[PDB]
Each structure stands twice: as structure tokens, then as C-alpha cells.
Amino acid sequence: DAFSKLKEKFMNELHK
């Protein structure tokens, strides 16, 4: 779903 796909983008943003 949208949430888990956005979470993946957020992980890049976190620098993880």
C-alpha cells in the first residue's frame, strides 16, 4: 500500500 511504499522513500531520507 501507499504507506509502506512511502516508508521506503523515508528510509532513504533518514540516510539508512
Partner 1 sequence: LNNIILNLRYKDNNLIDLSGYGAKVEVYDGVELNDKNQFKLTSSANSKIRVTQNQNIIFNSVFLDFSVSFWIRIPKYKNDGIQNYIHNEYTIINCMKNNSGWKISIRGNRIIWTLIDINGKTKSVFFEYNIREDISEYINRWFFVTITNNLNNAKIYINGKLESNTDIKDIREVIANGEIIFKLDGDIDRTQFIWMKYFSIFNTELSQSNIEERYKIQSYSEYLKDFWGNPLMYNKEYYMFNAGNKNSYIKLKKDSPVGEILTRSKYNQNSKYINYRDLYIGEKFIIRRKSDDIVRKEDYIYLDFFNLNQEWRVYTYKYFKKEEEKLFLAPISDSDEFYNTIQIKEYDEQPTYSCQLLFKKDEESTDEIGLIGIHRFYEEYKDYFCISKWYLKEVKRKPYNLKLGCNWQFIPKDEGWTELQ
Q: How far is the CB of 8 from partner 1 (least distance, A)?
A: 10
User: How big, in percent rounded to 5, are the helix, strand and coil portions of the chain?
Assistant: 80, 0, 20
| Residues in 1-16 that interact with partner 1 by CB under 8 A | 1-3, 6-7, 9-10, 13-14
Closest CA to 3 of 15, 11, 16: 11
Element (DSSP H or E) covering residue 15? none
Query: Residue 12 CB, nearest distance to partner 1 (Å)?
Result: 8
Residues near partner 1 (CB under 8 A): 1-3, 6-7, 9-10, 13-14
